[PDB]
């Protein structure tokens, strides 16, 4: 009851898990026949956890000249010097 959903993929995976569980199980009526059904011992082993495939193993090289290291360095720099830049912008704004 205490976890929330922020990820549509995880939510859809769990919903698909529930759908296939409801298809795979049979519920006996509360009163009568009890239709003997040859139990299995591990719902976890009948519904294994699958790691999602993230990408395909072969693609085309999409290079456009940013080197992927200048990017990291610039992100670190603007995070480091964010608040100083807003302070400068504020004092420039309240400069009359």
Partner 1 sequence: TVKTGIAIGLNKGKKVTSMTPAPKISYKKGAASNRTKFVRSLVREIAGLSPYERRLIDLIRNSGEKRARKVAKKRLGSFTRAKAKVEEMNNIIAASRRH
CB of 16 to partner 1, least distance (A): 16
> Given the structure tokens 């519904």, which residue do they identify?
47
From the list RNA, partner 1, none, pick the one residue 75 interacts with, judged by a Cβ distance below 5 to 8 Å according to partner type. partner 1
Full DSSP string of the chain: -------HHHHHHHHHHHHHHHHH-----SSS--------S-HHHHS---PPP-S-S-------S--SSHHHHHHHHHHHTHHHHHHHHHHHHT--
Residue 55 interacts with RNA (CB under 7 A): yes or no:
no
Q: Which of 6, 30, 33, 59 binds partner 1 (CB under 8 A)?
A: 6
- Whichever of 6 and 80 has its CB closer to RNA, that residue is 6
Binding of residue 7 to RNA (CB under 7 A): yes
CB of 52 to RNA, least distance (A): 8
Which residues would be at the binding site for partner 1 (CB under 8 A)? 4-9, 11, 71-72, 75-76, 78-79, 82
């Amino acid at each position: 009851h205490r976890r929330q959903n922020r990820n549509q993929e995880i939510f859809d995976a769990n919903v698909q898990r529930l759908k296939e569980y409801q298809s795979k199980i049979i519920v006996f009526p509360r009163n009568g026949k009890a239709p003997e059904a040859e139990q299995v011992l591990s719902a976890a082993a009948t519904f294994p956890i699958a790691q999602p495939a993230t990408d395909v193993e072969a693609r085309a090289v999409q290079d456009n000249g940013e080197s992927a290291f200048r990017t990291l360095r610039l992100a670190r720099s603007e995070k480091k010097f964010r608040g100083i830049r807003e302070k400068r912008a504020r004092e420039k704004a309240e400069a009359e």
